[PDB]
Design a protein around this ligand. Structure first.
Ligand SMILES: O=C(Nc1ccccc1)N1CCN(C(=O)c2ccco2)CC1
Length: 121
């Protein structure tokens, strides 16, 4: 399976599944700075799934590793902002992270395999 471009639609489909997950609700749009006026004191680089989808659709990711770095930032920002590891939003983040990591592993493996095949000779 040596298609160098296949990751893009695989990531589109995975984002569609994440948007259907009730657990993505806190993370579908940029964090509410009116509700959380201290947010930017703690979070240097806000990230959300709508920003990830728009970056993908703009053609502004070169690899699935770059998309994976932005998705992981959503999960670290939620951890950086939680007052407790027993919070509803952080708890949703941990389940969604597990789901994402389970699904992204084959996308990354296939892509890196395809690049190695392209450079084989
Ligand atoms: O406002 C948010 N997101 C939103 C929701 C609806 C509309 C616009 C934006 N948030 C709150 C801050 N976040 C946290 O990860 C967190 C952990 C503990 C408390 O919040 C991210 C989601």
């Amino acid at each position: 399976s040596y298609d160098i471009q296949a990751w893009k639609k695989q990531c589109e489909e995975l984002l569609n599944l994440i948007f259907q997950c009730e657990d993505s609700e806190p993370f579908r749009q940029p964090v509410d700075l009116l509700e959380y006026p201290d947010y930017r004191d703690i979070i240097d680089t806000p990230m959300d799934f709508a920003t990830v989808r728009e970056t993908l659709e703009a053609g502004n990711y070169e690899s699935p590793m770059e998309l994976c770095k932005d998705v992981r930032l959503i999960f670290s920002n939620s951890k950086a902002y939680t007052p407790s590891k027993r919070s509803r939003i952080y708890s949703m983040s941990l389940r969604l992270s597990a789901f994402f990591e389970e699904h992204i592993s084959s996308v990354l493996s296939d892509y890196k395999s395809a690049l190695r095949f392209h450079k084989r000779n």
